[PDB]
Amino acid sequence: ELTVQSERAFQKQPHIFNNPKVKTSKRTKRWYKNAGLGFKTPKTAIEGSYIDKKCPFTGLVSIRGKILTGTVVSTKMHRTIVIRRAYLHYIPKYNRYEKRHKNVPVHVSPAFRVQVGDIVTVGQCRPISKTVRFNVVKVSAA
């Protein structure tokens, strides 16, 4: 991810040791997991070099809560996006509806590429920031 080792600390997957003694093939052993619920781990997640300890595939977070879908309205944060979730709220007295929306801050892995639009599917994880509780699990850049 554009010279991944751009931080003051060494970026690496915890407890994933790459032995300089053995003469292995890749020499860059990368750990990954299946996110579950039929969410396919992408090829960028498989073959990438990013660390992203908050990644739902190559990180230490797990998708175990609600699965929501929304429209990305902001990609201006680092590995975090804001999705707009539009819905209709029913007002019983008038027997009608009113448009409502709730912005959801979602962590986006470098495996996915997300721009404004790009209806995404997000899965609930443990709190990984003050506001973020969801990880992008399907990009659907359409």
Binding site: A9, F10, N18, P20, K130
Partner: protein, 184 residues
């Protein structure tokens, strides 16, 4: 005391939150241990559930693992040379997780001699069985000439009371030497 609640720390919209539920004990924080080096002084903190944490102040020795051969020798910590979070911890020689420290390396050299017998830094066919695949690395062994090994602290001295860690190798060693030569 220190509170970890989100009743302060105004909401994502920027609104200031009114104060309900005056500070709760289950939300408490505590002060950093700020582990120094030498003359071991470990205090017991009674934590929630009746459990116990160990605030290590002034830690001199730690268990450091080579991780290339799996030795994990107990050694003396010399000082802190790098810290990704604050150079002030390096300046004050504060022991803390992920800190880059220098360790004595003499137990590791002694183990290497008693295991391979290959004069790293200067029962007969056991060394023959531990065959010519005995060179460790040109950067892990060049430190033995000075008798100081760069290591990364892996435990949390303010949490567990220990200052264990592992000897840097490969790309991690290269990155940390590049950081050291950039900042010194």
């Amino acid at each position: 005391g220190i509170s970890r609640d989100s009743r302060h720390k105004r909401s994502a919209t920027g609104a200031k939150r009114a104060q309900f539920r005056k500070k709760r004990k289950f939300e408490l924080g505590r002060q950093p241990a700020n582990t120094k080096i030498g003359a071991k002084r470990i205090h017991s903190v009674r934590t929630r559930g009746g459990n116990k944490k160990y605030r290590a102040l002034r830690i001199e020795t730690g268990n450091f693992s080579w991780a290339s051969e799996g030795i994990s020798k107990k050694t003396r910590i010399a000082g802190v040379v790098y810290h990704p979070s604050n150079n002030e911890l390096v300046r004050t020689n504060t022991l803390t997780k992920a800190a880059i420290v220098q360790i004595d390396a003499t137990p590791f050299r002694q183990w290497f001699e008693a295991h391979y017998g290959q004069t790293l830094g200067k029962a007969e066919r056991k060394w023959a069985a531990r065959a010519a695949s005995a060179k460790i690395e040109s950067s892990v062994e060049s430190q033995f000439s000075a008798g100081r090994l760069y290591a990364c602290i892996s435990s949390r001295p303010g949490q567990s009371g220990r200052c264990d860690g592992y000897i840097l190798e490969g790309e991690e060693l290269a990155f940390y030497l590049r950081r050291l030569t950039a900042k010194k």
